[PDB]
Design a protein around this motif. Structure first.
Motif, mmCIF file in Angstrom:
data_model
loop_
_atom_site.group_PDB
_atom_site.id
_atom_site.type_symbol
_atom_site.label_atom_id
_atom_site.label_comp_id
_atom_site.label_asym_id
_atom_site.label_seq_id
_atom_site.Cartn_x
_atom_site.Cartn_y
_atom_site.Cartn_z
ATOM 1 N N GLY A 1 0.789 -1.223 0.000
ATOM 2 C CA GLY A 1 0.000 0.000 0.000
ATOM 3 C C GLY A 1 0.822 1.274 0.000
ATOM 4 O O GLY A 1 0.254 2.356 0.055
ATOM 5 N N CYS A 2 2.170 1.156 -0.033
ATOM 6 C CA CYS A 2 3.145 2.241 -0.073
ATOM 7 C C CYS A 2 3.880 2.320 -1.398
ATOM 8 O O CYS A 2 4.579 3.312 -1.627
ATOM 9 N N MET A 3 3.801 1.282 -2.246
ATOM 10 C CA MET A 3 4.573 1.282 -3.475
ATOM 11 C C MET A 3 3.973 2.158 -4.569
ATOM 12 O O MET A 3 2.799 2.024 -4.945
ATOM 13 N N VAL A 4 4.787 3.078 -5.055
ATOM 14 C CA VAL A 4 4.417 3.987 -6.130
ATOM 15 C C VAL A 4 5.462 3.946 -7.233
ATOM 16 O O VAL A 4 6.582 3.468 -7.019
ATOM 17 N N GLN A 5 5.102 4.435 -8.420
ATOM 18 C CA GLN A 5 6.030 4.512 -9.528
ATOM 19 C C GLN A 5 6.572 5.955 -9.586
ATOM 20 O O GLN A 5 5.817 6.909 -9.442
ATOM 21 N N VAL A 6 7.887 6.110 -9.734
ATOM 22 C CA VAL A 6 8.506 7.420 -9.841
ATOM 23 C C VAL A 6 9.168 7.503 -11.190
ATOM 24 O O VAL A 6 9.941 6.616 -11.557
ATOM 25 N N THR A 7 8.863 8.567 -11.947
ATOM 26 C CA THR A 7 9.447 8.774 -13.261
ATOM 27 C C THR A 7 10.109 10.153 -13.313
ATOM 28 O O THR A 7 9.553 11.130 -12.816
ATOM 29 N N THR B 1 -0.686 4.510 4.914
ATOM 30 C CA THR B 1 0.593 4.554 5.632
ATOM 31 C C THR B 1 0.494 3.743 6.908
ATOM 32 O O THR B 1 -0.327 4.047 7.770
ATOM 33 N N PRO B 2 1.290 2.675 7.032
ATOM 34 C CA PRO B 2 1.251 1.893 8.273
ATOM 35 C C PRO B 2 2.058 2.571 9.370
ATOM 36 O O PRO B 2 2.775 3.540 9.123
ATOM 37 N N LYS B 3 2.033 1.996 10.586
ATOM 38 C CA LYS B 3 2.925 2.426 11.660
ATOM 39 C C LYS B 3 4.316 1.954 11.191
ATOM 40 O O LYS B 3 4.435 0.804 10.738
ATOM 41 N N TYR B 4 5.284 2.872 11.103
ATOM 42 C CA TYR B 4 6.592 2.516 10.563
ATOM 43 C C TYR B 4 7.746 3.190 11.278
ATOM 44 O O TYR B 4 7.562 4.165 12.001
ATOM 45 N N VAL C 1 11.817 -2.265 -1.600
ATOM 46 C CA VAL C 1 12.292 -2.153 -0.238
ATOM 47 C C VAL C 1 12.333 -3.468 0.521
ATOM 48 O O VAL C 1 11.620 -4.426 0.196
ATOM 49 N N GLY C 2 13.204 -3.483 1.528
ATOM 50 C CA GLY C 2 13.373 -4.557 2.488
ATOM 51 C C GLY C 2 12.818 -4.085 3.818
ATOM 52 O O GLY C 2 12.962 -2.911 4.182
ATOM 53 N N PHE C 3 12.208 -4.995 4.579
ATOM 54 C CA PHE C 3 11.559 -4.637 5.824
ATOM 55 C C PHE C 3 11.349 -5.834 6.738
ATOM 56 O O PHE C 3 11.417 -6.992 6.327
ATOM 57 N N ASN C 4 11.024 -5.535 7.987
ATOM 58 C CA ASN C 4 10.591 -6.495 8.985
ATOM 59 C C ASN C 4 9.320 -5.905 9.592
ATOM 60 O O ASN C 4 9.112 -4.694 9.538
ATOM 61 N N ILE C 5 8.445 -6.747 10.108
ATOM 62 C CA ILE C 5 7.233 -6.268 10.751
ATOM 63 C C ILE C 5 7.229 -6.839 12.128
ATOM 64 O O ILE C 5 7.049 -8.042 12.249
ATOM 65 N N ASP C 6 7.591 -6.066 13.136
ATOM 66 C CA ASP C 6 7.563 -6.629 14.472
ATOM 67 C C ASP C 6 6.434 -5.953 15.158
ATOM 68 O O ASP C 6 6.347 -4.722 15.190
ATOM 69 N N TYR C 7 5.445 -6.792 15.477
ATOM 70 C CA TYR C 7 4.165 -6.419 16.050
ATOM 71 C C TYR C 7 3.354 -5.789 14.881
ATOM 72 O O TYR C 7 3.226 -6.454 13.849
ATOM 73 N N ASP C 8 2.845 -4.555 14.986
ATOM 74 C CA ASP C 8 2.109 -3.924 13.873
ATOM 75 C C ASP C 8 2.941 -2.828 13.152
ATOM 76 O O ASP C 8 2.424 -2.121 12.282
ATOM 77 N N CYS C 9 4.224 -2.693 13.522
ATOM 78 C CA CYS C 9 5.124 -1.681 13.009
ATOM 79 C C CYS C 9 6.053 -2.212 11.924
ATOM 80 O O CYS C 9 6.789 -3.163 12.151
ATOM 81 N N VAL C 10 6.023 -1.588 10.749
ATOM 82 C CA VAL C 10 6.895 -1.949 9.640
ATOM 83 C C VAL C 10 8.235 -1.231 9.800
ATOM 84 O O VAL C 10 8.268 -0.013 9.736
ATOM 85 N N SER C 11 9.325 -1.955 9.977
ATOM 86 C CA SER C 11 10.650 -1.347 10.061
ATOM 87 C C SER C 11 11.331 -1.467 8.702
ATOM 88 O O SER C 11 11.726 -2.567 8.305
ATOM 89 N N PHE C 12 11.421 -0.339 7.967
ATOM 90 C CA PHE C 12 12.059 -0.298 6.661
ATOM 91 C C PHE C 12 13.562 -0.262 6.882
ATOM 92 O O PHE C 12 14.067 0.594 7.613
ATOM 93 N N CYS C 13 14.270 -1.233 6.309
ATOM 94 C CA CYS C 13 15.713 -1.326 6.509
ATOM 95 C C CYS C 13 16.528 -1.252 5.244
ATOM 96 O O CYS C 13 17.742 -1.084 5.335
ATOM 97 N N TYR C 14 15.907 -1.427 4.086
ATOM 98 C CA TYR C 14 16.655 -1.459 2.842
ATOM 99 C C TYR C 14 15.868 -0.876 1.692
ATOM 100 O O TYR C 14 14.656 -1.032 1.622
ATOM 101 N N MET C 15 16.575 -0.234 0.775
ATOM 102 C CA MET C 15 16.025 0.243 -0.479
ATOM 103 C C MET C 15 17.014 -0.187 -1.536
ATOM 104 O O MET C 15 18.199 0.089 -1.412
ATOM 105 N N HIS C 16 16.531 -0.852 -2.568
ATOM 106 C CA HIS C 16 17.375 -1.358 -3.631
ATOM 107 C C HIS C 16 17.848 -0.265 -4.582
ATOM 108 O O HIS C 16 17.045 0.549 -5.036
#
Ligand SMILES: CO[C@@]1(C(=O)Nc2cncc3ccc(F)cc23)CCOc2ccc(Cl)cc21
Ligand SMILES: CO[C@@]1(C(=O)Nc2cncc3ccc(F)cc23)CCOc2ccc(Cl)cc21
Ligand SMILES: [Cl-]
Lengths: 305, 302
Positions: free
Chosen positions: B15-21, B98-101, B148-163
């Motif tokens: 629900g966060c992924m968008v296209q950027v041009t 937007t989730p809790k992040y 992106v790379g992420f973990n979800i611990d509890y209801d919070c998305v922790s974004f850790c990587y962007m390719h």
């Protein structure tokens, strides 16, 4: 580049997961439109599972005996009916997050994503294949019952599996979404065992083509084989027979890499008779059989949902 | 029972992924609140990639040079700023999904789920780990940048990587969500190479404890080892040194199985010496290193 065991994006399915409670049993339900689907064994106690008469157990339940929780919202059950081994709980509210969906029954060898859930809450997503013995090598703990298997084609979620039980070898058994078990299993606490499993030949070949696309060619050879000779060899190693349909399905991958399907079968024949000799293929020392030809094409082309 | 390489449910990230041009370049962005995060190389041409001066390339761009597409809706860019190797595009609509992040920078050995995307559309989800050489063995084609790379611990998305990049060996390099690259990598097409990769020792040990929890004990032995003797052996098989922190982290798994960490280290030493002899451990003929001690506890217990 890279080849990973990849599951479908689980979002469309996460918005359908609910918790179903009946008495002391809590498990997962799939809320699509105004119906919640779950294993019919949710009505059973531990003593009932030994020999249950599900119509007799169900007739004793009223709508209010089923507590359905969608997030922090309790849904109101207004009807209940059984279809094979699935309980269908009619609810007052249609799921506003219901995606475009189908119920499909898959064949052994076909792969799908499983959204493992506990208490109606998704905890993980993994990819697996319906084994030739109709079990799935899943990862499920107590409370995972009702977790579902699916594929996403374009924007349509095809639900193909609902988790019901774990066999003594740690493998799993379940039904399609119409409640028909995959395999000779029954939803009863009785002596049940997974039959002798075989390797999904067309899938190993698809994965060998994925290795070639990713730059692994060491296993290729100058040889070719006949479909009959390959099947004589394959049967010896507990590999499923390869049919002409499988050869046709591998056609696109055969054209992309320049390796004929029976040319790749001679690589597979050599790998079965001689092993990998200390080498790996896509980071694996075993021949991987949980990627279909379509999964390989989808991943080596980047199809989106 | 069962032990699978399991990814987090990707819904909160989809629900966060968008296209950027930007010009001819199209890649993925992460839309959180009113900001879209994407690799700053979206402003580059194929020629700009050898020695780009990002501040010079960015100063020439206006808000309307960035086309952001969220589904079939074009978002309006109302600001742009660069933070390290990430471009932050301020948009006129906050993401209602937007989730809790959190933004978390991970250490090598850590695992996360990757939602591979093309044209702002998610195509798949897989699990991987930050290798000791700071690369990830992902599955990414052209157009996957910004996934992106992420973990979800509890209801919070922790974004850790962007390719951001694919190295010549087919492995992948990227940044945290603050634009700092993991590893000695740069967002330039200059000759770069992944350093010699090693096996994540603490993770193999965690996975050996997962095998014991699932009933596999064939690899255990009557021996023990000092931490130093284990490391001398481990180094010879390109295994990362095991630190006292790793031994402490393995404490819970040691207590649950009744096998001391240094006794499990002795099984690993023997496994490295002998191989598996036709046997498997949790359906694998290789020692698996992309499950952390935390992943093992989460999957085996809850
Ligand atoms: C519903 O419970 C049964 C079941 O297999 N449950 C489980 C499903 N998945 C994973 C599991 C992991 C551990 C565990 F203790 C139970 C699991 C266990 C009791 O016997 C039966 C008999 C028939 C049927 Cl269709 C279900 C069941
Ligand atoms: C952004 O494009 C680069 C890139 O690595 N792209 C890719 C990323 N992921 C997977 C890929 C698969 C195939 C492919 F042809 C390109 C891929 C292309 C090469 O130059 C550079 C130099 C630096 C940086 Cl930070 C990025 C890039
Ligand atoms: Cl970390």
């Amino acid at each position: 580049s890279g080849f990973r065991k990849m599951a479908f994006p689980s979002g469309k399915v996460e918005g359908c997961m609910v918790q179903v409670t009946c008495g002391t049993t809590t498990l997962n339900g799939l809320w699509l439109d105004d119906v919640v689907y779950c294993p019919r064994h949710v009505i059973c106690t531990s003593e009932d599972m030994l020999n249950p008469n599900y119509e007799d157990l169900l007739i004793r339940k009223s709508n209010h005996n089923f507590l359905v929780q969608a997030g922090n919202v309790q849904l109101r059950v207004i009807g209940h009916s059984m279809q094979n081994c699935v309980l269908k709980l009619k609810v007052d509210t249609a799921n506003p997050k219901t995606p475009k969906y189908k119920f499909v029954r898959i064949q052994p060898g076909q792969t799908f994503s499983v959204l493992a859930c506990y208490n109606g809450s998704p905890s993980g997503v993994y990819q697996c294949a319906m084994r030739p013995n109709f079990t799935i090598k899943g990862s499920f703990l107590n409370g995972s019952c009702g977790s579902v298997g699916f594929n996403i084609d374009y924007d349509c979620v095809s639900f193909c599996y609902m988790h019901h039980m774990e066999l003594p070898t740690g493998v799993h058994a379940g039904t399609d979404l119409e409640g028909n078990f995959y395999g000779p299993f029954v939803d009863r606490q009785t002596a049940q065992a997974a039959g002798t499993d075989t390797t999904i030949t067309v899938n190993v070949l698809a994965w060998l083509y994925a290795a070639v696309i990713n730059g692994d060619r060491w296993f290729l050879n100058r040889f070719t084989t006949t479909l009959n000779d390959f099947n004589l060899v394959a049967m010896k190693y507990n590999y499923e027979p390869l049919t002409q349909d499988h050869v046709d399905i591998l056609g696109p991958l055969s054209a992309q890499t320049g390796i004929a399907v029976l040319d790749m079968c001679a690589s597979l024949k050599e790998l079965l008779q001689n092993g990998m000799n200390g080498r790996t293929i896509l980071g694996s020392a075993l021949l991987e059989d949980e990627f279909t030809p379509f999964d390989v094409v989808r991943q080596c082309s980047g199809v989106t949902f």
